[PDB]
Ligand binder design. Structure first.
Ligand SMILES: NCc1ccc(C(F)(F)F)cc1
Ligand SMILES: NCc1ccc(C(F)(F)F)cc1
Length: 330
């Protein structure tokens, strides 16, 4: 079997993407943030503290005839930006774009951090990293992808994120009309639970390509591109007036400047990120300082190929027994 769902940016800056997901019987449709950097499927629910809910659609397990409480199970997660949530665990039927999994662990939030409450458009997260990162205790739970793997035509899913436009998540097949050229596959390390791979180098604008190994993770749940300080400094040095601002927390640049493109290597292939993808707009309403989409990973401890990079490509997450990542131009 296969599944296909449209994913839509939540705002004009592509800060995140939401995808409709059907949970329960009869279906309750929630818009979830598909996150290849985590492994929990958690939702706002009827059990969430009422003051912590501001416009989200909530999952109500008591209205689903297939929902079962997973006796004694709890979950608690903290994200790399300081966000967190926690609660209990149901199992229920979950469908994405026609692809149905029965008995999927649905983690019901009793408490969410402020950053989720303020994001009225995101009803929860659907984790697509490896199941070793799932936070359910005492019995660890499998991701939607892991549960679907057996019945998929091919154990893959693909991410085709749009620039200021809708995109597609496909499960179980590779749409050969959605990219140009060939797909370049590269090895994945699962040792930390992430879709971790090694980029073969980078170039700034029309400069020389610098061959150098950048280890990092493919993360649809992170907005920006976080790279080593040496790389990020070489990029922003080509932008007149750009500087690192401690009060803002990263590189900013004059909104009137034109940004150079950024190229990253995948084996012998090259993925080019247009300079416009790196503009994240004014730091405050009316400001003439704009926030950059390429930032240093020094404070984070790991390099992150977030949406800024992934939306420049067609990306194959190949969950075969030896996992690989595929990149194609589009
Ligand atoms: N998108 C989920 C996620 C969030 C944070 C991290 C970090 F910061 F720990 F690397 C990885 C993955
Ligand atoms: N990387 C996971 C993640 C995804 C979304 C959010 C936000 F934006 F909703 F707070 C935080 C963390």
């Amino acid at each position: 079997s296969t599944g296909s769902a449209t994913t839509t940016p939540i705002d004009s800056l592509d800060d995140a993407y939401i995808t409709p997901v059907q949970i329960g019987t009869p279906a309750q449709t929630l818009n979830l943030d598909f996150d290849t950097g985590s492994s929990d499927l958690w939702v706002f629910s009827s059990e969430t503290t009422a003051s912590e809910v501001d416009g989200q659609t909530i999952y109500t397990p008591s209205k689903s005839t297939t929902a079962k409480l997973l006796s004694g199970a709890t979950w608690s997660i903290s994200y790399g930006d300081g966000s967190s949530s926690s609660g209990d665990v149901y199992t229920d039927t979950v469908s994405v774009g026609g692809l149905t999994v029965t008995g999927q662990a649905v983690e019901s939030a009793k408490k969410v951090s402020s950053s989720f409450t303020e994001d009225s458009t995101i009803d929860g997260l659907l984790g697509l990293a490896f199941s070793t990162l799932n936070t359910v205790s005492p019995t660890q739970q499998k991701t939607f992808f892991d549960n679907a793997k057996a019945s998929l035509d091919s154990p893959v899913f693909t991410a085709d994120l749009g620039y200021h436009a809708p995109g597609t998540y496909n499960f179980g097949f590779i749409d050969t009309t959605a990219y140009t050229g060939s797909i370049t596959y590269t090895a994945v390390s699962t040792k930390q639970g992430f879709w971790e791979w090694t980029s073969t180098g980078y170039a700034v604008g029309s400069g020389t390509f610098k061959s150098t190994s950048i280890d990092g993770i493919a993360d649809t749940g992170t907005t920006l591109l976080y790279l080593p300080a040496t790389v990020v400094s070489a990029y922003w040095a080509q932008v007149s007036g750009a500087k690192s601002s401690s009060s803002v927390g990263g590189y900013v640049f004059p909104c009137s400047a034109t940004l150079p493109s950024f190229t990253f290597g995948v084996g012998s292939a090259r993925i080019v990120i247009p300079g416009d993808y790196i503009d994240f707009g004014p730091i405050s309403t009316g400001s003439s300082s704009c926030f950059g989409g390429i930032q240093s990973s020094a404070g984070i401890g790991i390099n992150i190929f977030g949406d800024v990079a992934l939306k420049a490509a067609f990306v194959v997450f190949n969950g075969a027994t030896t996992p690989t990542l595929g990149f194609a131009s589009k």
